[PDB]
Amino acid sequence: VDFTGYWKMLVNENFEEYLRALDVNVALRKIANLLKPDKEIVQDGDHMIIRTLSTFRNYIMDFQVGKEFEEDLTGIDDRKCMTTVSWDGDKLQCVQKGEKEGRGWTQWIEGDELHLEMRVEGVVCKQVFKKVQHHH
Ligand SMILES: C[C@@H](c1cccs1)N(C)Cc1nc(C(c2ccccc2)c2ccccc2)no1
């Protein structure tokens, strides 16, 4: 599996409850639900760069698969986590150790679709992106 590409958001399901489970305030929650970020991903061996891009915020993950790293989430839910992204078959599994229980996400590909499931304290958000070729 190779996630390299430019991806455009198609659906964003149960995002508001996921943010509510992170204790994001109502007003910020309302702003975040209106965002439809693109994803620019470069998979370079075990080195992974995931750029989540929007006018409101560019969130950059730059990590080595299998290596724990300190993830700065202050601009999101005002927290930090010790995060580990690992391979699980053809799926990418992320565990975010921190204050919130069961926090993490799973990423995988189906055809021309990038699938992203985010989780925290039983709440599941599901996002699907489409691979695109017009670069901005
Ligand atoms: C970005 C996301 C992931 C990146 C790679 C796997 S998940 N993560 C940080 C949690 C998350 N923030 C968001 C979303 C967001 C922004 C502000 C507050 C709460 C959520 C967002 C972040 C950045 C750009 C545009 C919208 N929606 O989800």
Side-chain angles (χ1 to χ4, degrees):
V1 56
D2 185 342
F3 293 102
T4 303
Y6 199 59
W7 308 87
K8 211 166 145 163
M9 173 173 280
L10 187 74
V11 301
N12 188 2
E13 172 184 38
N14 208 26
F15 190 51
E16 200 271 358
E17 284 289 289
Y18 168 83
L19 290 185
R20 200 177 65 111
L22 291 175
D23 312 292
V24 172
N25 74 48
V26 60
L28 186 48
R29 293 207 303 272
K30 301 290 95 175
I31 294 171
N33 192 35
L34 292 169
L35 303 173
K36 288 174 235 193
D38 307 333
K39 299 243 178 195
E40 177 187 284
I41 302 172
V42 179
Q43 179 172 323
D44 188 7
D46 289 339
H47 182 203
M48 190 92 46
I49 295 178
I50 299 169
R51 298 162 163 120
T52 306
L53 308 160
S54 75
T55 46
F56 180 78
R57 165 77 190 264
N58 287 340
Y59 186 79
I60 313 303
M61 301 185 66
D62 181 337
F63 58 91
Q64 309 276 342
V65 174
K67 295 310 209 293
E68 200 175 61
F69 65 96
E70 185 184 3
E71 194 184 4
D72 185 1
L73 293 155
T74 57
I76 314 300
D77 64 312
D78 215 334
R79 284 187 192 94
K80 295 185 179 65
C81 287
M82 299 304 302
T83 300
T84 292
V85 187
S86 61
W87 282 114
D88 182 33
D90 51 336
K91 309 198 182 315
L92 203 59
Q93 297 276 6
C94 175
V95 177
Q96 296 166 303
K97 307 163 179 198
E99 173 166 31
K100 282 286 157 163
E101 172 289 311
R103 190 178 184 163
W105 50 258
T106 305
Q107 207 175 255
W108 70 97
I109 286 187
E110 304 185 13
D112 69 355
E113 303 176 338
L114 176 68
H115 288 242
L116 174 63
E117 183 187 273
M118 295 182 289
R119 298 174 302 269
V120 63
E121 295 181 354
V123 180
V124 180
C125 182
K126 181 65 189 307
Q127 299 183 345
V128 181
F129 303 75
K130 281 274 178 173
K131 207 173 189 291
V132 288
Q133 314 298 329
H134 189 76
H135 197 243
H136 188 194

PDB file of all heavy atoms in Angstrom, residues 37-56:
ATOM      1  N   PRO A  37     -10.996  19.850   4.436  1.00  0.00           N
ATOM      2  CA  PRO A  37      -9.565  19.886   4.104  1.00  0.00           C
ATOM      3  C   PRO A  37      -9.193  18.868   3.038  1.00  0.00           C
ATOM      4  O   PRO A  37      -9.800  17.800   2.923  1.00  0.00           O
ATOM      5  CB  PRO A  37      -8.880  19.558   5.439  1.00  0.00           C
ATOM      6  CG  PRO A  37      -9.919  18.773   6.213  1.00  0.00           C
ATOM      7  CD  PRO A  37     -11.251  19.356   5.802  1.00  0.00           C
ATOM      8  N   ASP A  38      -8.178  19.223   2.244  1.00  0.00           N
ATOM      9  CA  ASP A  38      -7.485  18.263   1.402  1.00  0.00           C
ATOM     10  C   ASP A  38      -6.409  17.558   2.221  1.00  0.00           C
ATOM     11  O   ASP A  38      -6.030  18.007   3.311  1.00  0.00           O
ATOM     12  CB  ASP A  38      -6.846  18.951   0.189  1.00  0.00           C
ATOM     13  CG  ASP A  38      -7.837  19.788  -0.601  1.00  0.00           C
ATOM     14  OD1 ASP A  38      -9.041  19.463  -0.570  1.00  0.00           O
ATOM     15  OD2 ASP A  38      -7.410  20.771  -1.246  1.00  0.00           O
ATOM     16  N   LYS A  39      -5.920  16.441   1.687  1.00  0.00           N
ATOM     17  CA  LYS A  39      -4.777  15.733   2.260  1.00  0.00           C
ATOM     18  C   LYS A  39      -3.714  15.590   1.186  1.00  0.00           C
ATOM     19  O   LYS A  39      -3.984  15.061   0.105  1.00  0.00           O
ATOM     20  CB  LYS A  39      -5.182  14.354   2.785  1.00  0.00           C
ATOM     21  CG  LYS A  39      -6.221  14.405   3.884  1.00  0.00           C
ATOM     22  CD  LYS A  39      -5.693  13.856   5.185  1.00  0.00           C
ATOM     23  CE  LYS A  39      -6.746  13.957   6.293  1.00  0.00           C
ATOM     24  NZ  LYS A  39      -6.153  13.766   7.643  1.00  0.00           N
ATOM     25  N   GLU A  40      -2.503  16.038   1.488  1.00  0.00           N
ATOM     26  CA  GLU A  40      -1.348  15.793   0.638  1.00  0.00           C
ATOM     27  C   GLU A  40      -0.424  14.862   1.406  1.00  0.00           C
ATOM     28  O   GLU A  40       0.040  15.222   2.492  1.00  0.00           O
ATOM     29  CB  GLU A  40      -0.633  17.093   0.288  1.00  0.00           C
ATOM     30  CG  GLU A  40       0.623  16.875  -0.535  1.00  0.00           C
ATOM     31  CD  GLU A  40       1.419  18.156  -0.742  1.00  0.00           C
ATOM     32  OE1 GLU A  40       1.006  18.995  -1.571  1.00  0.00           O
ATOM     33  OE2 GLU A  40       2.446  18.336  -0.057  1.00  0.00           O
ATOM     34  N   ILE A  41      -0.173  13.674   0.859  1.00  0.00           N
ATOM     35  CA  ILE A  41       0.603  12.645   1.540  1.00  0.00           C
ATOM     36  C   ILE A  41       1.801  12.253   0.689  1.00  0.00           C
ATOM     37  O   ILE A  41       1.674  12.040  -0.521  1.00  0.00           O
ATOM     38  CB  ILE A  41      -0.258  11.403   1.853  1.00  0.00           C
ATOM     39  CG1 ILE A  41      -1.468  11.774   2.711  1.00  0.00           C
ATOM     40  CG2 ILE A  41       0.567  10.335   2.552  1.00  0.00           C
ATOM     41  CD1 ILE A  41      -2.436  10.631   2.869  1.00  0.00           C
ATOM     42  N   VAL A  42       2.965  12.141   1.325  1.00  0.00           N
ATOM     43  CA  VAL A  42       4.146  11.585   0.683  1.00  0.00           C
ATOM     44  C   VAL A  42       4.614  10.435   1.565  1.00  0.00           C
ATOM     45  O   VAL A  42       4.943  10.645   2.738  1.00  0.00           O
ATOM     46  CB  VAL A  42       5.253  12.635   0.499  1.00  0.00           C
ATOM     47  CG1 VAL A  42       6.468  11.999  -0.162  1.00  0.00           C
ATOM     48  CG2 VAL A  42       4.740  13.815  -0.314  1.00  0.00           C
ATOM     49  N   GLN A  43       4.592   9.225   1.019  1.00  0.00           N
ATOM     50  CA  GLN A  43       5.106   8.040   1.689  1.00  0.00           C
ATOM     51  C   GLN A  43       6.484   7.751   1.113  1.00  0.00           C
ATOM     52  O   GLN A  43       6.611   7.510  -0.089  1.00  0.00           O
ATOM     53  CB  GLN A  43       4.171   6.855   1.484  1.00  0.00           C
ATOM     54  CG  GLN A  43       4.633   5.586   2.134  1.00  0.00           C
ATOM     55  CD  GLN A  43       3.570   4.507   2.058  1.00  0.00           C
ATOM     56  OE1 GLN A  43       2.381   4.797   2.169  1.00  0.00           O
ATOM     57  NE2 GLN A  43       3.990   3.261   1.863  1.00  0.00           N
ATOM     58  N   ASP A  44       7.513   7.800   1.971  1.00  0.00           N
ATOM     59  CA  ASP A  44       8.928   7.789   1.569  1.00  0.00           C
ATOM     60  C   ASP A  44       9.623   6.743   2.439  1.00  0.00           C
ATOM     61  O   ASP A  44      10.180   7.058   3.489  1.00  0.00           O
ATOM     62  CB  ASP A  44       9.511   9.186   1.740  1.00  0.00           C
ATOM     63  CG  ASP A  44      10.900   9.333   1.171  1.00  0.00           C
ATOM     64  OD1 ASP A  44      11.411   8.395   0.507  1.00  0.00           O
ATOM     65  OD2 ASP A  44      11.471  10.422   1.412  1.00  0.00           O
ATOM     66  N   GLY A  45       9.562   5.487   2.009  1.00  0.00           N
ATOM     67  CA  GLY A  45      10.001   4.406   2.880  1.00  0.00           C
ATOM     68  C   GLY A  45       9.086   4.334   4.088  1.00  0.00           C
ATOM     69  O   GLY A  45       7.861   4.373   3.958  1.00  0.00           O
ATOM     70  N   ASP A  46       9.670   4.248   5.281  1.00  0.00           N
ATOM     71  CA  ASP A  46       8.894   4.326   6.515  1.00  0.00           C
ATOM     72  C   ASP A  46       8.679   5.759   6.987  1.00  0.00           C
ATOM     73  O   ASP A  46       8.057   5.966   8.034  1.00  0.00           O
ATOM     74  CB  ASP A  46       9.579   3.514   7.619  1.00  0.00           C
ATOM     75  CG  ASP A  46       9.483   2.013   7.386  1.00  0.00           C
ATOM     76  OD1 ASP A  46       8.586   1.580   6.630  1.00  0.00           O
ATOM     77  OD2 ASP A  46      10.297   1.266   7.971  1.00  0.00           O
ATOM     78  N   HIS A  47       9.183   6.746   6.250  1.00  0.00           N
ATOM     79  CA  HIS A  47       8.973   8.151   6.570  1.00  0.00           C
ATOM     80  C   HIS A  47       7.674   8.604   5.923  1.00  0.00           C
ATOM     81  O   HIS A  47       7.511   8.493   4.703  1.00  0.00           O
ATOM     82  CB  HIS A  47      10.136   9.006   6.071  1.00  0.00           C
ATOM     83  CG  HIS A  47      10.005  10.460   6.404  1.00  0.00           C
ATOM     84  ND1 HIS A  47      10.655  11.446   5.691  1.00  0.00           N
ATOM     85  CD2 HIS A  47       9.315  11.096   7.380  1.00  0.00           C
ATOM     86  CE1 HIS A  47      10.364  12.626   6.209  1.00  0.00           C
ATOM     87  NE2 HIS A  47       9.555  12.442   7.237  1.00  0.00           N
ATOM     88  N   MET A  48       6.755   9.127   6.730  1.00  0.00           N
ATOM     89  CA  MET A  48       5.433   9.524   6.260  1.00  0.00           C
ATOM     90  C   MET A  48       5.195  10.993   6.584  1.00  0.00           C
ATOM     91  O   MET A  48       5.484  11.449   7.695  1.00  0.00           O
ATOM     92  CB  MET A  48       4.347   8.647   6.898  1.00  0.00           C
ATOM     93  CG  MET A  48       2.974   8.839   6.286  1.00  0.00           C
ATOM     94  SD  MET A  48       2.557   7.733   4.923  1.00  0.00           S
ATOM     95  CE  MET A  48       3.067   6.135   5.554  1.00  0.00           C
ATOM     96  N   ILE A  49       4.675  11.731   5.609  1.00  0.00           N
ATOM     97  CA  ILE A  49       4.284  13.120   5.783  1.00  0.00           C
ATOM     98  C   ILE A  49       2.838  13.225   5.335  1.00  0.00           C
ATOM     99  O   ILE A  49       2.530  12.944   4.172  1.00  0.00           O
ATOM    100  CB  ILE A  49       5.173  14.082   4.980  1.00  0.00           C
ATOM    101  CG1 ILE A  49       6.611  14.055   5.503  1.00  0.00           C
ATOM    102  CG2 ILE A  49       4.638  15.479   5.048  1.00  0.00           C
ATOM    103  CD1 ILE A  49       7.545  14.957   4.719  1.00  0.00           C
ATOM    104  N   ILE A  50       1.956  13.597   6.259  1.00  0.00           N
ATOM    105  CA  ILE A  50       0.542  13.809   5.979  1.00  0.00           C
ATOM    106  C   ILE A  50       0.244  15.271   6.255  1.00  0.00           C
ATOM    107  O   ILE A  50       0.354  15.726   7.400  1.00  0.00           O
ATOM    108  CB  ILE A  50      -0.354  12.910   6.841  1.00  0.00           C
ATOM    109  CG1 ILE A  50      -0.050  11.439   6.563  1.00  0.00           C
ATOM    110  CG2 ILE A  50      -1.808  13.215   6.560  1.00  0.00           C
ATOM    111  CD1 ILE A  50      -0.704  10.485   7.563  1.00  0.00           C
ATOM    112  N   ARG A  51      -0.142  15.999   5.217  1.00  0.00           N
ATOM    113  CA  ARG A  51      -0.476  17.410   5.323  1.00  0.00           C
ATOM    114  C   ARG A  51      -1.982  17.541   5.147  1.00  0.00           C
ATOM    115  O   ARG A  51      -2.506  17.233   4.074  1.00  0.00           O
ATOM    116  CB  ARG A  51       0.275  18.225   4.275  1.00  0.00           C
ATOM    117  CG  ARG A  51       1.785  18.160   4.422  1.00  0.00           C
ATOM    118  CD  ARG A  51       2.529  18.582   3.154  1.00  0.00           C
ATOM    119  NE  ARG A  51       3.927  18.885   3.461  1.00  0.00           N
ATOM    120  CZ  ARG A  51       4.980  18.270   2.928  1.00  0.00           C
ATOM    121  NH1 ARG A  51       4.820  17.299   2.040  1.00  0.00           N
ATOM    122  NH2 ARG A  51       6.204  18.629   3.294  1.00  0.00           N
ATOM    123  N   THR A  52      -2.670  17.978   6.206  1.00  0.00           N
ATOM    124  CA  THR A  52      -4.107  18.247   6.176  1.00  0.00           C
ATOM    125  C   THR A  52      -4.280  19.750   6.006  1.00  0.00           C
ATOM    126  O   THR A  52      -3.924  20.526   6.900  1.00  0.00           O
ATOM    127  CB  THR A  52      -4.778  17.757   7.454  1.00  0.00           C
ATOM    128  OG1 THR A  52      -4.440  16.373   7.651  1.00  0.00           O
ATOM    129  CG2 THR A  52      -6.296  17.927   7.353  1.00  0.00           C
ATOM    130  N   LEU A  53      -4.825  20.163   4.867  1.00  0.00           N
ATOM    131  CA  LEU A  53      -4.740  21.548   4.427  1.00  0.00           C
ATOM    132  C   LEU A  53      -6.122  22.173   4.370  1.00  0.00           C
ATOM    133  O   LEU A  53      -7.042  21.587   3.788  1.00  0.00           O
ATOM    134  CB  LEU A  53      -4.090  21.647   3.048  1.00  0.00           C
ATOM    135  CG  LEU A  53      -2.745  20.948   2.854  1.00  0.00           C
ATOM    136  CD1 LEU A  53      -2.451  20.710   1.379  1.00  0.00           C
ATOM    137  CD2 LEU A  53      -1.657  21.784   3.509  1.00  0.00           C
ATOM    138  N   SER A  54      -6.246  23.364   4.957  1.00  0.00           N
ATOM    139  CA  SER A  54      -7.455  24.177   4.907  1.00  0.00           C
ATOM    140  C   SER A  54      -7.080  25.618   5.231  1.00  0.00           C
ATOM    141  O   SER A  54      -6.030  25.887   5.824  1.00  0.00           O
ATOM    142  CB  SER A  54      -8.519  23.680   5.891  1.00  0.00           C
ATOM    143  OG  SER A  54      -8.183  24.030   7.224  1.00  0.00           O
ATOM    144  N   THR A  55      -7.962  26.544   4.845  1.00  0.00           N
ATOM    145  CA  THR A  55      -7.740  27.950   5.166  1.00  0.00           C
ATOM    146  C   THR A  55      -7.640  28.159   6.671  1.00  0.00           C
ATOM    147  O   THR A  55      -6.832  28.965   7.146  1.00  0.00           O
ATOM    148  CB  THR A  55      -8.870  28.809   4.594  1.00  0.00           C
ATOM    149  OG1 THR A  55     -10.133  28.201   4.898  1.00  0.00           O
ATOM    150  CG2 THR A  55      -8.724  28.959   3.082  1.00  0.00           C
ATOM    151  N   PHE A  56      -8.457  27.438   7.439  1.00  0.00           N
ATOM    152  CA  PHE A  56      -8.447  27.611   8.887  1.00  0.00           C
ATOM    153  C   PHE A  56      -7.129  27.155   9.497  1.00  0.00           C
ATOM    154  O   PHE A  56      -6.597  27.810  10.401  1.00  0.00           O
ATOM    155  CB  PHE A  56      -9.603  26.836   9.511  1.00  0.00           C
ATOM    156  CG  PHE A  56      -9.676  26.958  11.006  1.00  0.00           C
ATOM    157  CD1 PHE A  56     -10.202  28.095  11.600  1.00  0.00           C
ATOM    158  CD2 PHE A  56      -9.219  25.934  11.818  1.00  0.00           C
ATOM    159  CE1 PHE A  56     -10.276  28.205  12.977  1.00  0.00           C
ATOM    160  CE2 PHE A  56      -9.285  26.039  13.197  1.00  0.00           C
ATOM    161  CZ  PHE A  56      -9.817  27.176  13.776  1.00  0.00           C
TER     162      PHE A  56
END
